[PDB]
Amino acid sequence: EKRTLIAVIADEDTTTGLLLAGIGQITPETQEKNFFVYQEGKTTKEEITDKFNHFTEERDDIAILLMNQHIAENIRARVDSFTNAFPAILEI
């Protein structure tokens, strides 16, 4: 389909491992980034929510949004209210 890419909302260590596996890297043709780093005490709930809606409603090439469970817990009502077919949200 059109939806081929994985997006990432993840703490520092998970992002590091994902970027080593090539996940969340820049899409060559569009130059878009496919990751946002959560930093406890720095990132607000509003920024997490904004990045969520971006990867989820403002991008159209995302098949799967990966997030740490604890980050999904921080915005659980926004996550539980997501209803679209795509992307699939997987909590890691």
UniProtKB/Swiss-Prot annotation:
The keyword Lipid metabolism does not apply. Transmembrane segments: none annotated. It comes from the Eukaryota. One of its GO terms (molecular function) is proton-transporting ATPase activity, rotational mechanism. It is a peripheral membrane protein. It is found in: Vacuole membrane. GO terms for biological process: endosomal lumen acidification; Golgi lumen acidification; proton transmembrane transport; vacuolar acidification. Keywords: Hydrogen ion transport, Ion transport, Membrane, Transport, Vacuole. GO terms for cellular component: fungal-type vacuole membrane; Golgi membrane; membrane; proton-transporting V-type ATPase complex; vacuolar proton-transporting V-type ATPase complex; vacuolar proton-transporting V-type ATPase, V1 domain. Its main location: membrane. Subunit of the V1 complex of vacuolar(H+)-ATPase (V-ATPase), a multisubunit enzyme composed of a peripheral complex (V1) that hydrolyzes ATP and a membrane integral complex (V0) that translocates protons. V-ATPase is responsible for acidifying and maintaining the pH of intracellular compartments. V-ATPase is a heteromultimeric enzyme composed of a peripheral catalytic V1 complex (components A to H) attached to an integral membrane V0 proton pore complex (components: a, c, c', c'', d, e, f and VOA1). Present with 4050 molecules/cell in log phase SD medium. Belongs to the V-ATPase F subunit family. This is V-type proton ATPase subunit F. It comes from Saccharomyces cerevisiae (strain ATCC 204508 / S288c) (Baker's yeast). The gene is VMA7. The chain holds residues 3 to 94 of 118 of the full protein.
